[PDB]
Amino acid sequence: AFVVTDNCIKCKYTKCVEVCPVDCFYEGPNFLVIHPDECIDCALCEPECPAQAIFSEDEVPEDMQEFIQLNAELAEVWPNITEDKDPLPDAEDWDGVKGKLQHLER
Numbered sequence: 348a349f350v351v352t353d354n355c356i357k358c359k360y361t362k363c364v365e366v367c368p369v370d371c372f373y374e375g376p377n378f379l380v381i382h383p384d385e386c387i388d389c390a391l392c393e394p395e396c397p398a399q400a401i402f403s404e405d406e407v408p409e410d411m412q413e414f415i416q417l418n419a420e421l422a423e424v425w426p427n428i429t430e431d432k433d434p435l436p437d438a439e440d441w442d443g444v445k446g447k448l449q450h451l452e453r
């Protein structure tokens with residue numbers, strides 16, 4: 348599975364969903380997650396993320412290991428997103444700010 352981590356929050360560019368062959372991204376108000384059972388690890392999304400927030404599970408940074416379980420949990424409750432849309436209004440002000448998990452919205 349590929350995993351969306353911290354830098355997506357408050358950015359949510361949605362470029363990643365274009366390239367997904369199996370449509371396994373699920374949408375939250377200010378963040379996206381990958382459903383781990385559905386992802387086929389084709390890795391096509393992680394060049395596309397402008398926030399460089401997507402990682403192969405086995406490459407998730409040590410300080411971001413919570414995101415693996417979080418993607419699994421939230422994928423079950425959020426709606427499937429299959430079309431990209433516009434980025435959040437202020438996405439590049441937040442691009443690269445650290446510690447954005449305290450701002451996640453369910």
Ligand code: SF4
Binds near residue numbers: 385
């Ligand atoms: S690795 Fe491939 S299948 Fe998994 S989320 Fe990214 S684009 Fe979709």
Ligand code: F3S
Binds near residue numbers: 351362364379400
């Ligand atoms: S910012 Fe988030 S919405 Fe997709 S394009 Fe990067 S993982």
